[PDB]
């Protein structure tokens, strides 16, 4: 019957690894590098687009940075379509929580939910896992500014600074070198862009190959504001930090 054709996506190897999770991680290693850096007064999300062309409409384009609600955003590394399935599920969970408790969802509770969905695809159902790794940048009134990552296994961890996608080994060393705990957002913006500029497989880092975002508690009247940077604004910050 049908058994003949079944790849068995939810089995252990003899070494106790999940084949499909490992191979999905291999896929993610070829995706454009995404970086998240947490500062005392905000969070930076920077990400590099892949295989850009001149004829791509950049100002209406979104492949890396997505809004989950007004307080939480994500940077994507992997299959964009797979990411959008999960993103829409996360957006719903946040609104379910808001409806139930009349409070914005704490960052970790959303992260755990998405990570649990990813976990399920590795333990049951016989389906391939989601080929996506997320960096979650968010704020709530319990833990303040938070960075998390999740990968196809459904494991998640918290970070002060982190990278996903291509050249994470190199990227993480550079972040580990220059990151300090008392760092501010404007400094973190510079660190993120400098790290991408050195780890990129492209010849030079330009505005058309980047997506950029900041979550700053600072706002007039102390409200958290998410800023997805426009193409011209990325171009300005590249000049300001002295990369172009």
């Amino acid at each position: 019957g049908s058994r003949r054709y079944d790849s068995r996506t939810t089995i252990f190897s003899p070494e106790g690894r999940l084949y499909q999770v490992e191979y999905a991680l291999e896929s993610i290693s070829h995706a454009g590098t995404a970086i998240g850096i947490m500062a005392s007064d905000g969070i930076v999300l920077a990400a590099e687009r892949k295989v850009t062309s001149t004829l791509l409409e950049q100002d209406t384009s979104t492949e890396k940075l997505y809004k989950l609600n007004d307080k939480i955003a994500v940077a994507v590394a992997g299959l964009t379509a797979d990411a959008e399935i999960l993103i829409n599920t996360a957006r719903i969970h946040a609104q379910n929580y808001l409806k139930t408790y009349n409070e914005d969802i704490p960052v970790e509770i959303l992260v755990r939910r998405l990570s649990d969905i990813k976990q399920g695809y590795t333990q049951h159902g016989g389906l391939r896992p989601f080929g996506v790794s997320f960096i979650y940048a968010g704020y709530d009134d319990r833990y303040g500014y938070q960075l998390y990552t999740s990968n196809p296994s459904g494991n998640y961890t918290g970070w002060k600074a982190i990278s996903v996608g291509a050249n994470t080994s190199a990227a993480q060393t550079l972040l580990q070198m220059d990151y300090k705990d008392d760092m501010k957002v404007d400094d973190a913006i510079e660190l993120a862009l400098k790290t991408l500029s050195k780890t990129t497989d492209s010849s030079a880092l330009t505005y058309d190959r980047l997506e950029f975002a900041t979550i700053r508690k600072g706002a007039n009247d102390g409200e958290v504001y998410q800023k997805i940077f426009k193409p011209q604004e990325i171009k300005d910050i590249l000049v300001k930090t002295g990369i172009t």
Partner: protein, 204 residues
Amino acid sequence: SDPSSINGGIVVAMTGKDCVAIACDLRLGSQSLGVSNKFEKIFHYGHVFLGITGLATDVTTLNEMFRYKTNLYKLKEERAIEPETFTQLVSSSLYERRFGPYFVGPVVAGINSKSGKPFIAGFDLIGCIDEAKDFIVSGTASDQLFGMCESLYEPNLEPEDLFETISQALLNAADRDALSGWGAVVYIIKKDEVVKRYLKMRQD
């Protein structure tokens, strides 16, 4: 017994020159017993305002439901929902409970951000849209409001003239209804400013 008159209360909305107004009383009761004088019946999702009269649990539930839906709308559409679009969403959402409906009287008010056109609308409990340019009324003193609005209203009123018209329409209607009153709020809505005024009225 009648779910639409257990808790009581009213909403009225009006159009003016480059503006709209929406207003409501503040009463919540259990039939004869007054329970709350701070039960606001007007909510907003971006620049679109929604008033809801009727059974108070459904008022609250529908507010929570439309906040949910307009939040997801905004995330997907990358823009705030417009009054015309929202009106259709309310109608759809009410009619999907055709045979177990929410006992409510919604009223939409807002200005279309692109055309600048003032917009107001109303619905029956199962979603039929009352789409009228002059005024929309709802609640346990809807008859009283129809009477006040029909005689006080005239077209193209300036924001502060319109404030006086809608306020007097609300106040005097509420005072002829046992189940309405206990305070009142009036929103004056222009293309990029909204003024919210609480009115002084009799507390019986």
